Amino acid sequence: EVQLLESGGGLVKPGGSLRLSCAASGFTFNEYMMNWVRQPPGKGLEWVSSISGTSTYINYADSVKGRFTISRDNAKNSLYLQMNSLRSDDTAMYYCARGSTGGYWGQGTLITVSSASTKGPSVFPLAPSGTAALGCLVKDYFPEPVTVSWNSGALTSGVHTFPAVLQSSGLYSLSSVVTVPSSSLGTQTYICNVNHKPSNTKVDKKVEPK
Amino acid sequence: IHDFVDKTLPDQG
């Protein structure tokens, strides 16, 4: 099947630079225009740049012209975006996408342009007191994202991982909760698996009844 | 049909 996968994102200071890459497979790469599209936090989709199959036609959004450069290496099935002179308002999820229809997209990679520094979270239990609830509090991290699973992916029913909130400190915090049978408490173990890749922080926290 | 349509180039400005 068609696959697209972005890499090279992350955190950078205002004025800094990053280079995004997108690896493609499952189609004849040089027959298609390739594109970068971004999604700023809480906003809609916005086109960034496009490059035709053999690089003849290159186009940029006005807001990035002169700062970003798109290119492709057809022999390597790869698309690139060199991003210079970055500003806080370039913060967004960046997607690579094929062609002109929007049919095939990568999974996206987050670019955060900020003066704040990487910080890994602390993970604390939300201990359970019919239906019970328990969870984990993932506190004080930067930049986004964090991922949370339960019981190494075995527990998915009843899970809610909340959108992160930016605290007044400038660090993020979120909780992940799950509702479970009260009769299971103290018998079934519950472990939240937290991964904050930007800081290389991974934690598995057991959540035990009070 | 999709792959053929997806190869179309948008018009330049």
Next chain:
Amino acid sequence: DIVMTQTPLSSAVTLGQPASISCRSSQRLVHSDGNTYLSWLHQRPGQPPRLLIYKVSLRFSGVPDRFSGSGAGTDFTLKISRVEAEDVGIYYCMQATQFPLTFGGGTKVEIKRTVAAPSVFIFPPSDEQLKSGTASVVCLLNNFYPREAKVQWKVDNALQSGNSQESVTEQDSKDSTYSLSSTLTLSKADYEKHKVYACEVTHQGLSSPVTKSFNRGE
């Protein structure tokens, strides 16, 4: 540049009933080859957009036929003949007829279901967090509808104002409910000066407010 004006910003639809989304282009949308290149996409939280319709009216592989697109000139429409619970999320039009490529601002589809009161849970701070000098107290409102809810924190009967933050999930794609967390954060030094920590919840599905509370340390 072609501006795509997408309406409505949000639409709430009864299960099984039709939905319609409009996008108007600022100029006639026609390619040099005579065709019109406009797509409709659906995006779920934390996921890439998914193509539904391309070239105005063609369905992408795997898309059910309850979705359809139409339009000409400047007026384009996505129709859902019968909404399903999984159709919640944000829909976008995209024109790829002429550079710069442009998107509509999005439409959020909500499923209207029967009122459901939240289940409410309160969580004291962990001993581990307290040892480090901070106390976070969490109040969870689980699986409720509609989204409107009020959560008030009281600490020894003092109403807290500005000391908490809320987060709300997007609408669940299976049961059409919302969940909400409210987190009150205090230093340990402050936390240990008070006894009763309580969260009081008001919601249409509750005949009167529900309070969950605990006493610090006991």
